[PDB]
């Protein structure tokens, strides 16, 4: 019983390691972070910032891509900053989100729930802490999620707006037409270091 | 001479299978390759679509990124065909260009020309066989070039609208505001390999 502990310990927190460590992350992202203290602008990446349900965890992932490890930060100037860092110690590349320069801009369309194979808005599977909303209609609110990728493409094809599209088997249609599918054994699930950690907390309780 | 008109033929014969056999590419773009007979909608990744004079080769190159290995398909069937196929066998993730899906618009701006570094459009660096020209649209034509990453922030203040750019040292911000920078061990020039291949040809000749 008192192993059982042990066990919990051993990974309710040596798993926090790994996160205030970031090690699914790129060298860079890596580099970046460690250097932490010549961007004071810098915030957070992407999957630090966002809350999703333990339920739909797997779903926000994919419309969210590479994106997970896009570095978030107040201003242009500290993008500039990282950009300069990285180029002279050639740490490889990343990808910057300057909180005064995205575009959180986002519509909604009347009639869509009443689309075939409609299952919501992906904005409404996530919260953000206000002083990062635009974040969030940048990330999501243009995006939407429905059943299958029949759906999807039939939609796609009807309104031919630039509106990202989710299928619940994970399936993505970007903005333009771009159509990322396909399955592997890591999963890939942006978020499951985190959830691990929803339930490890408070699954010793 | 013999020995080098041999020696050449032989070269030649190795960047092929590389070709062919996409040694290089993802596991699921590989995968999706050795079986192109289940897909006959199936054309090519995109770095083998794109006719490029060589100086430029390398810009054109930063300038698509992971969009190299996107795989173009005639229409949305095949698309959902790979889909499919990747999604039983857990091959891993691609991403698929539909040539009956992708939007293929882009916009001139009068005056653009007359801003500060600006450098020209990035359509006017690709050539495509016709039967390709959304894909071109699709890939650029949207896209410009400027000189620093300043004069691309400040342009994208501006105009503040959904152009893509790149700066000559290698930098990039999509069209919603997202800065891509940082230099790692140079080059990974994604024609290198069919430049040589056309380059053995002017050898035996």
Redesign the interface.
């Known amino acids: 019983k008192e192993k059982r502990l042990r066990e919990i310990q051993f990974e309710k927190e040596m798993i926090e390691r790994d996160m205030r460590e970031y090690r699914g992350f790129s060298r860079?992202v890596r580099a970046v972070f460690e250097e932490k203290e010549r961007f004071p602008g810098l915030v957070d990446v992407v999957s630090n910032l966002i809350e999703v349900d333990e339920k739909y965890s797997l779903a926000v992932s994919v419309l969210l891509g590479g994106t997970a490890q896009?570095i978030v930060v107040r201003n242009?100037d500290t993008?500039?900053a990282?950009?300069e860092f990285?180029?002279?110690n050639?740490?490889?590349?990343?990808?910057?989100?300057?909180l005064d320069?995205?575009?959180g801009s986002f519509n909604r369309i009347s009639g869509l729930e009443n689309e075939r194979g409609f299952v919501g808005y992906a904005v409404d599977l996530v919260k953000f802490p206000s002083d990062l909303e635009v974040l969030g209609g940048?990330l999501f609110g243009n995006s939407v999620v429905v059943e299958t990728?029949?759906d999807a493409?039939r939609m796609?094809?009807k309104y031919?707006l630039?509106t990202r599209i989710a299928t619940l088997?994970?399936?993505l249609?970007s903005?333009?037409?771009?159509?990322?599918?396909?399955?592997?054994?890591r999963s890939?699930n942006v978020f499951e270091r985190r959830i691990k950690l929803k339930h490890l907390e408070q699954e010793m309780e």
Chains 1, 2 share one sequence.
Do not use: H
């Open positions: 860079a896009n242009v993008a500039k990282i950009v990285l180029k002279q050639e740490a490889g590349r990343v990808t910057i989100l300057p320069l995205i575009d940048f990728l029949d493409i796609k094809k031919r630039n088997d994970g399936e249609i903005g333009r037409g771009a159509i990322t599918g396909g399955r592997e054994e890939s």
